[PDB]
Amino acid sequence: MKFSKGIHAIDSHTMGEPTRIVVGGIPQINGETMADKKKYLEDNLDYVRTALMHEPRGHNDMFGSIITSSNNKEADFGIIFMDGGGYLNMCGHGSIGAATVAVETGMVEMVEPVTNINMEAPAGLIKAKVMVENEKVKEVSITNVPSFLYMEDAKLEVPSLNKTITFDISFGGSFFAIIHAKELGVKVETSQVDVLKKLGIEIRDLINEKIKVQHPELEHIKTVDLVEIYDEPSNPEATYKNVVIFGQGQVDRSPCGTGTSAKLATLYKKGHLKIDEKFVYESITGTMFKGRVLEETKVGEFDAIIPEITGGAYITGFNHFVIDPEDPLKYGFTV
Amino acid sequence: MKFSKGIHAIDSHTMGEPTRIVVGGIPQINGETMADKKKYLEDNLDYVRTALMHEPRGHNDMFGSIITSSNNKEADFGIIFMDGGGYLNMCGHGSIGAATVAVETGMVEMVEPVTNINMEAPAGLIKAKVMVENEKVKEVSITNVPSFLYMEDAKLEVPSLNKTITFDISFGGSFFAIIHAKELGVKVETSQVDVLKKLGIEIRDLINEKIKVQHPELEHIKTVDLVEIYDEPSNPEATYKNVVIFGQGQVDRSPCGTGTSAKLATLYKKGHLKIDEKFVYESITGTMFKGRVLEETKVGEFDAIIPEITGGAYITGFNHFVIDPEDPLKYGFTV
Amino acid sequence: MKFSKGIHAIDSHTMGEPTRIVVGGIPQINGETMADKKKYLEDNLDYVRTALMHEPRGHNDMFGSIITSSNNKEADFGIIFMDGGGYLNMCGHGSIGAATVAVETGMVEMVEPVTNINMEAPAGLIKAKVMVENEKVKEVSITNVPSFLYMEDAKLEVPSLNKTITFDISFGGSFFAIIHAKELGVKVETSQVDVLKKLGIEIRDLINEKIKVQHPELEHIKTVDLVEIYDEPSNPEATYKNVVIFGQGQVDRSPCGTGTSAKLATLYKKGHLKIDEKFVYESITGTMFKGRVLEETKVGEFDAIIPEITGGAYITGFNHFVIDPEDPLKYGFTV
Amino acid sequence: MKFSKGIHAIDSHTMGEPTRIVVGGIPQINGETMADKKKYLEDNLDYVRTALMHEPRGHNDMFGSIITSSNNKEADFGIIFMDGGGYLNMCGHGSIGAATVAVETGMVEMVEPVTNINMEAPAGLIKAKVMVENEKVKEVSITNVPSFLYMEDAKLEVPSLNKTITFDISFGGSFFAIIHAKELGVKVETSQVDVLKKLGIEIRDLINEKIKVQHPELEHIKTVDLVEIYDEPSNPEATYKNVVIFGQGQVDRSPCGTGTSAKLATLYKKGHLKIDEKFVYESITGTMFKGRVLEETKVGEFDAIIPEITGGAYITGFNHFVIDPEDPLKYGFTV
Ligand SMILES: O=C([O-])c1ccc[nH]1
Ligand SMILES: O=C([O-])c1ccc[nH]1
């Protein structure tokens, strides 16, 4: 058996959304800042992303992260989020899995009450309170980048079909479009996952074509990579169901940590939330994250908030991914 | 890290369609015959299938197989095909993967012109000619179960939409419905993969409600588990594009071996194919299989054929698939 | 990367003495009875034994076991013991290792109070009582082949040096040469391990040359493959320290199992033990086994006993062992 | 299954002498310089070394290296040798292993004529020319620290037995005590490996007690951690047989790399070698290295040489090493 290249990685799941965490396939990535490290990857080893996020090794949806050398102070190691599309600037389910697994494997040397983990992440730092119940990780409270309301509703226009009106956009690590499922008239359920998909991505794009997308700091992002559609929850707990469309038409199985932290900055600046006050966000599956607002913060030029998301991940296998250099799909394909 | 259970299994890929080959999770499966080993599994360890085929470990589509102690004469080891749906009686892409990887890992001590592998399978035996080019596996000619035309056009009736007419059915390890893409007016392409998927499974069901499905021997099958839609290829090589829908609404990335070994028996009995005479089947991807008729044979009560399917697989990972017994999805979910 | 072959195996350790258990690197081995499997191996795939037990993948000492398809009734799977030297007919630390790991990995589904495991082995059957503490394997009570006192002392003659006298020989799966460390004047300790080693294998040999070695039943063993030297323990618990020399001049880091089961018979028939009554055996490391006599039995011609040995193993790694066909030592070497 | 920590590491062998290369069990180790890393390890995670290099996982002899983050310029990654004893400051077998595998696995993207690798190491930098035969790694020319003749013969005194005279000492990364096998009267063979072992360490020690051991530069080594014994080769090729004793009484299955780079400096400065001119060194196994002198250099105070050692490693298995926290020998033991 010829192979050439051999990638080691840990398959987790945070609330059903898969994270595949890379470990040993490369010993070294320079980058410098954790946005530079991401750019390096993208413009150099995209072939690793595609190979592992696409078929045949992965699938549409499917999601993963690289565990780096940090460079940074305070932060243990550094995280680069990747997907079937590209490289997400920030990801809650990801952050969760990463941390869960770091401790689990004992890459971190675990502390009993809780374990604090400071990770890099392309967009600012992140900290994860990792509850451990003597023996196990019980769950994880990640505290996120400054999230905020961006552009108050704003008119939308959707060619297919009708050309509707109101919807809000907000940051939370990336830029989410938050639109209500009544607004376009979708049922945030298994039924329509694909119509949701094509609806989401079609909005994302024609939103990305003709808008002002900009962070008044970090000055790189300037994109609406994400579409959150939400509606009343058919679970008793949780304040809403959301589904989150992203990366070349994929859909999150979790409520999307970055999507909840964004949504929390677009309550609050609305009134319907006070600092703390348990938020719970329902996904499109039957799974739920325990969000809440922590503090106030005016980012660069306009008011904002720093929110705390609280999920939990499980280990679902170890891989030695390999590529037979004959395999004419050795760097993977889509559909 | 607590884990309780630990499954060893090699990811492969025949022509795009994944085959996840199980190796070392269990050291015993009694069954007896390779239909009695499939029942055992079905009724007992189904938890294995679901866990591996279904998220978060696998996906909708996705496919695999258990390498088993043989019992049988001639045959080396014994195969059991499993899928997002259930336990396919026979599968080419799988038999290909299973052979490729048996040799490639040196479970089979490789012979240099070609290696002959006799595998069990739920429906009859199968022999793989394995072409090895000093070092590597170059490709695989699998010679399939007796295929044959079964019924002939016959009544159709599709509620959504219109209620059309002609279409054929035939056996090639499993019972295929072979209906032209003009017949229901679908384009066998990426575009519509999903409408094809819901179309396929709806026909497969309402066809299985009101028909005569029966193999005159083996006397267990009696089902139309599969829907082959075909049309003129938009690849210069290959006689037709086919797309195969099966198991709980999933689609084969390959042309389907059993689908091609079926569709060969329902030419020939048609005139448009002489014994030998290269058939090439284009999948729904861009991939192709080199099929061709080998010999004549009347099965039990009616005339038939024994076809040869020729493809090729690649290794794409080694896994220690583990279940955290805290992982509430530890046996996996659908959508 | 280029490898041809790829063995799966799990590294354990039973009271320090390593047991490497083989899993996935073959799906079949015919043999028939768990002596005819051992002969098949010995006289066909010795190149597995040497490759794993010898350098550069194993070492002097080192020990391992093959998990097989059973064939037999009652018995789950089947075990084949192998060492630097050859294939050991029965081993306690092996049987322990094998059982602990079977359950732990979930190749056996675990039963809560205890799990019973019936394993084949090249000398009879063996049953392991697997104590599981809700979650974990606590330890293991293996119940062992009819042990007995064979040949009352008998004179030894040792060239280097002097030429001494008394020492006894027994059976407990294999034939043990029990001799007191005061008899040859050795200190069963770290200090002299190697003089013990060479003293042992010289006795074993020149004993094997000029004696009557015979089991009245099974009629294949007829060998003294083992040398047990014992003295007053410098651990408070345990009735003695023993060290066990075997297979091409290696030494057992555990008290040995088969060696303890042997020695128990040759108390008892001595008067210094009553059915039950805790025996504890100290190794040549600081590690201990909990042995005790279960019931009487006169084997074929002469009186005997059936003993129980109690220990506990730990997992120390997972291996995808591979052989680069260019690696001139692919099948390994000794010194 | 329950496991505290999970270490990814690749087993190799350079000319029979094992090198176990760590990969993924950690993502970080601060240190700073590839000495200050080695110290950090030595005075913090000596529980890694001992676990892996000692039983039950490793053995007496046995050896392995850590692949690090570099910090340094030019150099890809960084290397930390480790052995049954401590942490070798430089080692040929290692630097070879480490390079062979880095390319072979595709951690380095391979260049066809030869790949150049710059690795850190505790003692300076090293560069490896890695010869790749289109597909494979054929062999590896590592260029080594300025070697030299230190102290002309000097009288030894050996208590067991007689008390002999002449023997030289040199540097090649570490300080080698080169003495002829006629000098003490030992046959550098299998027969006496253990008398050689105990002779070596006893010399190494009583040499370290009463001598002047000093590098004029780097100012941290000041030790004779190595004992080379050499004699006429009973292999046609190779100028001499040497066996190399080090680290807590272990023996080197290769000729030693550092031990050859040393010995080369103490020919040459002797007149029996001209710049280039193939030197070949035989090991205490039948195995050889292709050494030669590259260029002159007077280190700090006294004359010297920079040599080039040429060998070739092979992968022998992939490990997920795991420690059951119950495993009382979790951190491993000696004898
Ligand atoms: O889980 C999340 O935070 C996420 C990021 C992108 C989609 N979901
Ligand atoms: O290629 C095949 O054999 C197959 C079976 C089911 C789907 N494809």
Model description:
The structure is a homotetramer of 335-residue chains. By secondary structure, chain A is of the alpha+beta class. The first copy, chain A, has two domains: 148 residues, Diaminopimelate Epimerase, Chain A, domain 1 (Roll); 164 residues, Diaminopimelate Epimerase, Chain A, domain 1 (Roll), CATH 3.10.310.10. Chain A is built from five helices and 18 strands. In chain A, the strands form three sheets. In chain A, strands 8, 9, 10, 11, 12, 13, 14 and 15 form an eight-stranded mixed β-sheet that branches. The first copy, chain A, has a five-stranded mixed β-sheet with strand order 4-3-2-1-18. In chain A, β12 and β13 form a beta hairpin. In chain A, 59% of the residues are buried. Chains C and D meet through β17 of C and β18 of D. β18 of chain A pairs antiparallel with β17 of chain B. Bound molecules: pyrrole-2-carboxylate (2 copies). One pyrrole-2-carboxylate binds next to α3, β12 and α5 of chain B. Chains A, B, C, D: Pfam families: Pro_racemase.
